[PDB]
Amino acid sequence: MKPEDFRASTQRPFTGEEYLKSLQDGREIYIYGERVKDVTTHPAFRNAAASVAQLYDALHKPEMQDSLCWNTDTGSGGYTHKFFRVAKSADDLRQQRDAIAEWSRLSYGWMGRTPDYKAAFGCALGANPGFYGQFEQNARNWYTRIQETGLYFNHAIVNPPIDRHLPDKVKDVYIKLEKETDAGIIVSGAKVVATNSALTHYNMIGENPDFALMFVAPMDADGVKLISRASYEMVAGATGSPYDYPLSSRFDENDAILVMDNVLIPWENVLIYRDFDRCRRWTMEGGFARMYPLQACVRLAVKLDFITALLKKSLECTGTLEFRGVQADLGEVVAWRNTFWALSDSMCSEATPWVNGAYLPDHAALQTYRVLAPMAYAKIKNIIERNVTSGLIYLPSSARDLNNPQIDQYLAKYVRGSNGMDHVQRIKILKLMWDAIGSEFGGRHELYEINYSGSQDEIRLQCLRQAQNSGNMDKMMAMVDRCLSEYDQDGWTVPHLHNNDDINMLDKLLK
Amino acid sequence: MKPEDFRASTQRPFTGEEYLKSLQDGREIYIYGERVKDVTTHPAFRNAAASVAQLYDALHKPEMQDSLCWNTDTGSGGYTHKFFRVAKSADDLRQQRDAIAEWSRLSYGWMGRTPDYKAAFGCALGANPGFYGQFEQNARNWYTRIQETGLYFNHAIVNPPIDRHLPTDKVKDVYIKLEKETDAGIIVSGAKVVATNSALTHYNMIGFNPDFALMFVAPMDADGVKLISRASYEMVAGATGSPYDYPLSSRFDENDAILVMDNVLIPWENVLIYRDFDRCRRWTMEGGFARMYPLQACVRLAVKLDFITALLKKSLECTGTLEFRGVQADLGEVVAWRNTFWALSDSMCSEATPWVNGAYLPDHAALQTYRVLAPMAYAKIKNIIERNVTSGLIYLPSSARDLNNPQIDQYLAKYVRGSNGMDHVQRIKILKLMWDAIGSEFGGRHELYEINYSGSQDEIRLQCLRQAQNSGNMDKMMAMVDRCLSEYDQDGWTVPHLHNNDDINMLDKLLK
Amino acid sequence: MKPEDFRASTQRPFTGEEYLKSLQDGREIYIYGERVKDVTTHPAFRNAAASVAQLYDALHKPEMQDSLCWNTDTGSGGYTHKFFRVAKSADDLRQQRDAIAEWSRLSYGWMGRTPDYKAAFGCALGANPGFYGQFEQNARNWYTRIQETGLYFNHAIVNPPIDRHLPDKVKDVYIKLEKETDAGIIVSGAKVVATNSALTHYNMIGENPDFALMFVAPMDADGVKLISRASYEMVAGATGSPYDYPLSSRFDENDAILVMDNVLIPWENVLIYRDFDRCRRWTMEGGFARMYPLQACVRLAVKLDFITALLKKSLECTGTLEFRGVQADLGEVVAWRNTFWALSDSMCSEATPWVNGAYLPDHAALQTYRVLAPMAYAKIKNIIERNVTSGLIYLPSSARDLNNPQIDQYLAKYVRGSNGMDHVQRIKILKLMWDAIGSEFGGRHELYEINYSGSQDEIRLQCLRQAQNSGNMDKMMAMVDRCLSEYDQDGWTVPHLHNNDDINMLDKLLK
Amino acid sequence: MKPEDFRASTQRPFTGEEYLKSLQDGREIYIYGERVKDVTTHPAFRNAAASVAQLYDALHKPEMQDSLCWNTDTGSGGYTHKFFRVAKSADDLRQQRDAIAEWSRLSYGWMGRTPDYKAAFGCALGANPGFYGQFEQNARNWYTRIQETGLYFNHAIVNPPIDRHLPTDKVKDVYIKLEKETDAGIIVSGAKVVATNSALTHYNMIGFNPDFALMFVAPMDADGVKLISRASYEMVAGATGSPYDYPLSSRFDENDAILVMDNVLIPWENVLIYRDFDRCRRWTMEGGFARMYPLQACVRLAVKLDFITALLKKSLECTGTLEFRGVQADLGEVVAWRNTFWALSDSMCSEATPWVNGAYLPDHAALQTYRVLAPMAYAKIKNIIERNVTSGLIYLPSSARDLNNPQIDQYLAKYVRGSNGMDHVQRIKILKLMWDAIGSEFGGRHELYEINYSGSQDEIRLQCLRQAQNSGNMDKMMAMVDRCLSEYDQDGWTVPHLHNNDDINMLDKLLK
Ligand SMILES: [Ca+2]
Numbered sequence A, C: 001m002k003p004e005d006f007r008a009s010t011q012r013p014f015t016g017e018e019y020l021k022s023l024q025d026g027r028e029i030y031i032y033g034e035r036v037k038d039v040t041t042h043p044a045f046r047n048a049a050a051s052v053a054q055l056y057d058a059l060h061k062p063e064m065q066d067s068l069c070w071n072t073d074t075g076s077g078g079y080t081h082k083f084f085r086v087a088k089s090a091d092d093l094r095q096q097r098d099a100i101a102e103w104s105r106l107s108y109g110w111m112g113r114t115p116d117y118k119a120a121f122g123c124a125l126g127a128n129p130g131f132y133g134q135f136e137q138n139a140r141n142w143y144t145r146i147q148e149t150g151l152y153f154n155h156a157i158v159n160p161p162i163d164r165h166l167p168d169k170v171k172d173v174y175i176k177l178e179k180e181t182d183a184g185i186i187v188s189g190a191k192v193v194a195t196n197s198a199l200t201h202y203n204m205i206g207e208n209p210d211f212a213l214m215f216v217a218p219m220d221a222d223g224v225k226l227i228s229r230a231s232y233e234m235v236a237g238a239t240g241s242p243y244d245y246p247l248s249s250r251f252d253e254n255d256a257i258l259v260m261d262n263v264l265i266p267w268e269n270v271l272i273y274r275d276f277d278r279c280r281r282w283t284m285e286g287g288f289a290r291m292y293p294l295q296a297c298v299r300l301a302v303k304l305d306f307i308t309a310l311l312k313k314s315l316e317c318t319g320t321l322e323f324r325g326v327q328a329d330l331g332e333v334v335a336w337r338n339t340f341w342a343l344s345d346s347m348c349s350e351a352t353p354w355v356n357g358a359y360l361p362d363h364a365a366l367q368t369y370r371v372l373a374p375m376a377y378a379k380i381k382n383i384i385e386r387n388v389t390s391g392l393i394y395l396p397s398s399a400r401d402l403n404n405p406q407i408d409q410y411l412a413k414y415v416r417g418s419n420g421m422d423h424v425q426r427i428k429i430l431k432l433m434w435d436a437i438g439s440e441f442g443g444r445h446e447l448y449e450i451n452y453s454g455s456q457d458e459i460r461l462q463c464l465r466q467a468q469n470s471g472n473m474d475k476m477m478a479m480v481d482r483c484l485s486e487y488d489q490d491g492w493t494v495p496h497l498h499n500n501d502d503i504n505m506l507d508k509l510l511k
Numbered sequence B, D: 001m002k003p004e005d006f007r008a009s010t011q012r013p014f015t016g017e018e019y020l021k022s023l024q025d026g027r028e029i030y031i032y033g034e035r036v037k038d039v040t041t042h043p044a045f046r047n048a049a050a051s052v053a054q055l056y057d058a059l060h061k062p063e064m065q066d067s068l069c070w071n072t073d074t075g076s077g078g079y080t081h082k083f084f085r086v087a088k089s090a091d092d093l094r095q096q097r098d099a100i101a102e103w104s105r106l107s108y109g110w111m112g113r114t115p116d117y118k119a120a121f122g123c124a125l126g127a128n129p130g131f132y133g134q135f136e137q138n139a140r141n142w143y144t145r146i147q148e149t150g151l152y153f154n155h156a157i158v159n160p161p162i163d164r165h166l167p168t169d170k171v172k173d174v175y176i177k178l179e180k181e182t183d184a185g186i187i188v189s190g191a192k193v194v195a196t197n198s199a200l201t202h203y204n205m206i207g208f209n210p211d212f213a214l215m216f217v218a219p220m221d222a223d224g225v226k227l228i229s230r231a232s233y234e235m236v237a238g239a240t241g242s243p244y245d246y247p248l249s250s251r252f253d254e255n256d257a258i259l260v261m262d263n264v265l266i267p268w269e270n271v272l273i274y275r276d277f278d279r280c281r282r283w284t285m286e287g288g289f290a291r292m293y294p295l296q297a298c299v300r301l302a303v304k305l306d307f308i309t310a311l312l313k314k315s316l317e318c319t320g321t322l323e324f325r326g327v328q329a330d331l332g333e334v335v336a337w338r339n340t341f342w343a344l345s346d347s348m349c350s351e352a353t354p355w356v357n358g359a360y361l362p363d364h365a366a367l368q369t370y371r372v373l374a375p376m377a378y379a380k381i382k383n384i385i386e387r388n389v390t391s392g393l394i395y396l397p398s399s400a401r402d403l404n405n406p407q408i409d410q411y412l413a414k415y416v417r418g419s420n421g422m423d424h425v426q427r428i429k430i431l432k433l434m435w436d437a438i439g440s441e442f443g444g445r446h447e448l449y450e451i452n453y454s455g456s457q458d459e460i461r462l463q464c465l466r467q468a469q470n471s472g473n474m475d476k477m478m479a480m481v482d483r484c485l486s487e488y489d490q491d492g493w494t495v496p497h498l499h500n501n502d503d504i505n506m507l508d509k510l511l512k
């Protein structure tokens, strides 16, 4: 059974209930040395699964449909989330920017790999299917399927480590073509950082041409397996509570290892085959890399709306918000929050036509978001840590402490909010702040924001390459060349400026 | 004679020639212990004056007029720089953004107080004249005047220091204060500091016991108006250097002066706020100028960053270090900062809101963001340049005189070539241009200017916070946090879609 | 029964066994809404208690005694840890510096509030007992007791928050004298950030003179209670393993709220009584503030030895240590690690005589350590996070994954060390790094290092005040004043320099 | 005539007068397209020459001799600066540290290439002469010479740029290379860049196909030795300023030149390494100099930070902002950085280790730490100053000529007073001193110098890592991590004092 067959109607994406039923497919997932029977009921994934299901439910609410949905461009007569359909103007991109922000607000910016992230990949297939040559019809069909059903795609792109001392064994670790058959291709290898793949329907995977592949793999195919990292949702449930870990308990996106063990990929799922030329050209010509950072920038901007107000609430509680230096530190967090919204505005207003009527967001703004976000996030976290100087480190252990009157009587007296809040509300706000930055979930989120789109050198190199490839550097260079042409070793070459022959005193001085 | 009377036509702003003639008035400027006889010929100001004159000439050039000008809204049938006329849409602001960029490119982003800077003040007077009460007609007339003529306004806003040990009488006399009220106007005395490029301006706007609660326009040639100049990088570059050695110092120096007002008569036609503490306190928020000028400043910086970015790339091509991954990454970060200020200027226009009388204001959050980011970005970009041109800047031959002496030149031709194939003349020229941008006294002054531009580091951050609070932005962010908090309590979830931990919590079994 | 009565001998401090027995005293501690019966057996404290007991055991090992111990100066004929006795030379301080480093190495620098931290307070009482006036004999007796027994002292100094809108109620939150009796004083209030107080014997607590107090409070006195924060030791035990959380499982120092509810403090335990003059003078004259940062700097330097080598091991595993930029980032961590050792060298070599033959470490070096440590620690953590770009975020969940052959077979193939390490060793190293920086314990440690001795402005202000009070600023100022005296508005005032009258061209130019 | 023959006595180093006479030789220096006739009288070098002469005079002053000098170890019965004689204990290094600080205080930390900088090279030759093989006696004789006379040595180590597009023949001719071997010595050609203060030195040490594998001593007056100077901040300050306006530029400028060697004859007595790639590669690690000079550099910077710290405090007293908590915190951080470099110099001496022939070397880890921290600390301190003197530096009156003109001076007396009660003359003087330290072209050059001092940011960090590895420090840190790892495995603790989690782990009960 195909995931899309769980829908009661072919004219709309999944509802939350249909999405949850579609995950009960015998996918192979491991956590804590055991196989997961059902992701929708398992204590490590059930609330994250319920959080994603809320996004699907919002598409069917009349009050949210103007902001979230458009009709499909397929002629099916149905509707879809705006970011699942190819943008054909700067205004289309702005409407998609707002639809992404509306979905991101349902997780307060904490879910980074929701269905709209890879919906940009579906749009890349639909806008430029001709790029894939003999696999053009696969690109067209996959765009149609993703758009109409609201299929939850992810990607597994980071390669696993290689032992430099191994013999043959080295060329077996990476995703490699092992056999070509009539039904399709047989593949083996692994990809790391398969973020929230336990809750997805499909994963896109991308001098020996056997390594030059791009294909779609279903989460329930024989040989497809996930090896999970520690679950902050399960730990928060087993040893904490929603009051103590309000983000860990519902928004944890498990960063897994995606294993492919002798997996048959049907020809209908192949996009690039034994083609080093198309693989090298895909980052620049495919469209996806020129589209997804719009989603990521908006998602971060929503998370920064949350962090900014949460920091203000935390400082109202500590009473340090009265200090000039504290207000200045909060003001800088506000400036960073404003930056990411302004970048998303520029991404849309400066959008350019691409191919087949499609529009792409401003490429310089996408690269800028990638460079600034790790620095802004690390700086904002340091600002929070140095401003809530004492308030976070000694928080009572549990909601159980508030529910024990022998303990609660002291918390009511000694842990009140400076701005008049009762102890229950003060502790609640500070626990929410701690889960955002210092819990294992908070620590993982920092590592995620810093390393998301690559190393610090790599993101800066790609920002430079974009300025060069777009012609931006040539235009900046033309201005410097003009400045240089206006003078030489003999003086000005322009008539409006005064030469120094009448005022230079060096001949008279050095005579 | 009024400065506008130097124009041969009432249908356009000054040409460069007319602007230069208008500066040959009774202005009283001191530098190096001497009174300046004529700013347009004096070795400390002549090239900076010639650089501003080029901006005026560009307004009348067919190849530039399309990007720079619009017709006046006064019914005169004339034209003006787009930023001298009130914006009435988001598209109007984008056109003004482009017109500012075109003028800023004529100085490669190095002149920060050109006439378009205070043209936002003229627009503030025109958009909201009713704010000034009995002085409403002065606001209307000044808007008309500035717009049609392209008058070069400036301001001196920073108060001078006060000795805390002097009597209460002596400390009060230092600030701008009303001395006497007459039939012709008001008599004022005091001083303002950081009167950047006031030597080349027509008028200065001066603003904040009601005798201290004033806002007025003062001509640069009024009796009792005097400027005490700082050291001239233009004059030093001319006397001991050359355009080759100091290519920016020699033409774009904007002298940061002390503006003195010694018993100056201000006619009633030039008064905007009079003995009114309420209007003075309300002006930053309601006047409009503070909500307009950072659009000019952000664009000006973005143009300077276009210049610095490519100049850094050229310098690294010469040193040959551009082949290193870490060097390319450092240049990539400069590119990201350059991109940021352009993206902020895009948002300022696209997110513009209606104000009063059909006027539009740029996005206020984006103006505050530019003010906070610019000092950090500029200091970081300068550090990136310093640590990447590790040797190339410090030993540059002294002078174009070294290149013009064959005995010295023959060794420079052999040992100081560009790594990318440039001859020594071009290699030294590029690196001297980079040094003038960052390490010369002009380069050092520019860093101090970009860092301290719109106030202290705490003040700019406080104003960014105040804007989020006053606009309702903080209330909306707070509504999202309040919604998160309402979804659970000390007993569990308050929303039905999430699973409570009663079936998995192990603390009862573990404890007791 | 007194803690010291648990020792089988009066001529040596506690052994580990005797220290553990001494904690079974009916102290009142809460965690997870429940009373703790015994800290030595409770799942939230038992390993942290066992870790402290190892320090006591090391004092009795012949192989460690040259580095750890000296004879007492009390005439008892016994021995003690070197830092529990007053230093009387620069060499004494250097020997105490080495003894602190030896004890700190037993927790790899992760235990910040071990008995040697407050041993500096015992030494402050012994070096200057005359400061306490009528309480001089209490200072002498407490120094003797702490030194001979190796009593585990802590301090509770951070005040709890105050609700600005409360009426009377405001002046009840802080530690305040409520009654003066023949036996002693009655006190009430609370102190926050009582780090590892669950494992201590005593805590030192320090216009209305009822608030101007300094006294010693036993952990088992009626009305003395601790309200604990979440236990990373218990969470690591319940949902993890030593392999998964190797630091959280044995070095967690619980940051508690210390409550004093109508506590009788006997006159023998009072050090400063209703004396605003002595309270204000104590930071500058007491000695403790001029002593404890030697312990803290050494402790951090040991933690940086650990982090530096752990980062190198982690980069060997990822294989990125081959990159120039990665080696430079590691080199900076090395430079920070070297700084804190160099500061501890200067603290000892530049030591000055104080009172009664006692020596104090260099005060400028103590203030410098306090300013630099938050910046260095935040920077080192950012270096680690941006250099282990992928390796930390997807680590398999558990030692249970390695013990399941179905999962282990893929980890053996795809998660090997780049430098030839097997997957078990690669995962182990990276989990150790993650527990140091990203676990909740790692997050708490960052908050601790940043905020330890106060806000960022406060530590910088105290560094400035030290330069001014010591005469250092006056000497730097004398050099600037000399530079200024060498010229005036007319030229040089010194004869060796050439005036510019023969070369100044301004008269000729401006004529 | 040899430079040492200018001394009236063989029992002491040069006096200031004798040092100045020794510079009036055949040295060939160019500046501003002209050959310098006499460095001691030329307007670009005369005060820098006079500043170095004061250091030599201080060696013979009773009030300073106690801190600066020791007897020679040569048996001559004379004395020398402590840093010119091989250290044979940790206490010897502390005494040399203090002698360096005393000399550095005479320039307030602004002269970075004074004679004590390369005196560490003389000590490297004396401590390990056997390293040089057949040139061992040259090493011994040069140590004796440098120590007894106080010869001013320097080095030019940075190679000049090479055009990558030139033929393999042309690119090779650029670097220092052996041209011919004769009976008298060797003929060399090539160039070195960043020859800081070479115009005022006696000899330069020049070091790294075996023709390129050389180390030798070259006198500044040898035929074919030429300097091409950078712009002179001393001359510019003299021609267009005054000591009041530029108090550091006017006396402490160390010109960063290009050192050219055109068919120079180097006598065999001056050769140290000849056509030996093995000795050239080993010299950084085994020579001793690289393990000695950073003690001088760290002390010199620490003295400059004593100056900057108090100068910042004086400047903030004048602006009156020192009353603000955030301003006091910013000054407190500058104090912490100043304290760091002194603490590093203490550790360099107390942790000194024995080397060869009884010689001691400062702690190597502390030298590498100083190199990594100094560029970050200096850039941060400069940013702190710039953002805290928000207005005070940018508008300073142009000249002492303004104070000497009563018409201008009367307004400065009223409007430019110090907030702490200082008169305008003292307020402007302090702020001009601060500006010359950070924003003048001299201040800009000093920032570039401190940042790029001992190499690129990656290179200094790599050398810090290599030192931890080569010394065994990394192995010892690794032994601690290996011990932590050995205390547990995938089955639990391997140590008996800790409790395993079998009784509390809830995963079996929770899963399956
Ligand atoms: Ca006049």
Ligand SMILES: [Ca+2]
Pocket (backbone or CB within 6 Å): D025, D026, D027, D028, D221, D222, D223
């Ligand atoms: Ca000669």
